[PDB]
């Protein structure tokens, strides 16, 4: 599918080894650094659980055969073989077919930059099977962009020689063939900053579907130019603003300034992927154990401009810290649809979220501790006061809500009516307020 077809989607990001088991065990995994046993049928069995929160797309782990310990998929060995830990080729096709039958997209995570670690330089059984196929090993100096591109991620992931045309062609065929064989609707591209930027347009063209690229960097002037090559980027610049406001009490000018910086630096903010958690960052609740602040952050993330991503296990209140502690197994939760955050995410992401022709007006009211924006016909009011807050809030409603319009908040059923271009209401437990016109 193309960018236009992704604009109104909402993505559930899962780690395949950690989402679901086909044997229905709920038992804990004793080593989060090695395979825990998740598989495709384990995902397929829970598509109703995912869709019930309003998600209409899933992002899955990379699929190829990995080196030892590559439970996350990012350590490819032979790119053209499947990771047998996750299940059969028929199980992957069946998951995609089942998702499509529910109107859902499947986004494949892809790596072009590197292979997994090779024991003593033995590239036996690797797609790129001779040391000459990789750049010489060196440690990245992240202040030297050519180093970022030529040296080895984590100083041990063999860095594929992306300046050799035969290798470039191979990488193109790898991604094209994954997409066409399994009928993926989009890709999430790993390690984008680690290959020369001009490689990426040819790679997305080979894939033939919408791509969102991972440029792990908070500087929009560094990330933004990559959208000349790729349809979308992972919104790392906004991520830091969201965390600063909701987990560290920054004023909302941090978010309004960052939204301006994104508009200045990205040709199309509307397709950037918005997130507040992922597999490379400690989960929000490990940083700030305040459910009201997290709910505000999630309401903002899901409904602001862009294409939202929610990291699996958010909806069960998962709270693990740094990798691997943020790759908890989900099956211990038994997929509880009565969990606090499941019900909350369903309101935001199923009930309020616009699923076609998404429109957002940012910066309807920028306060110090409050922020209002419109999403569709709804007025979204977020805050960073904290749990327990019952502060009176007054916000402007913007140009499309008439005086005398009755608004009802979908989260806490607060009622407020527009008077003189504003609403005033009292917070409930510091919660975000998602005002729907009567
Ligand atoms: C993970 C991430 O790394 C890189 O991101 C950099 C970023 O480029 C830097 O700029 C900076 O970011 C700044 C940012 O720019 C600022 O604006 C902001 O203010 O601050 C941040 C933070 O300083 O740092 C980050 C993080 O270092 C890449 O650019 C990015 O693409 C990466 N994300 C991708 C990539 C991979 C690789 O395919 C995925 O990770 C997978 O692989 C890793 C590595 O194997 C694995 O890591 C776990 O397991 C390892 C065995 C363990 N030890 C290894 C790491 C070493 C040093 O890094 C060695 O010392 C050691 O010998 C190695 O064995 C790791 O510690 C452990 O975390 C992941 O589990 C696996 O998932 C990412 O998931 C993917 O999204
Ligand atoms: C920048 O990185 C490249 C690639 O590793 C390296 O060859 C070059 O010497 C670096 N520049 C400096 C000044 O160190
Ligand atoms: Ca590279």
Residue numbers in the entry: 1 to 438
From the paper:
Here, we describe the structure and function of three novel α-amylases from Cordyceps farinosa (CfAM), Rhizomucor pusillus (RpAM) and Thamnidium elegans (TeAM) with a higher stability and pH-tolerance with the potential to act as novel biocatalysts for various industrial processes. The sequence of all three enzymes groups them in the GH13 sub-family 1 along with, for example, the amylase from Aspergillus oryzae (also known as TAKA amylase). All three amylases have the classical domain structure with a central (β/α)8-barrel with the active site located on its C-terminal face, together with a small subdomain, inserted between the third strand and helix and a C-terminal β-sandwich. All three amylases have as their hallmark a shortened loop between β2/α3 and two shorter loops in subdomain B located between β3 and α4 of the central (β/α)8-barrel, compared to structures of other fungal amylases, e.g., TAKA-amylase.
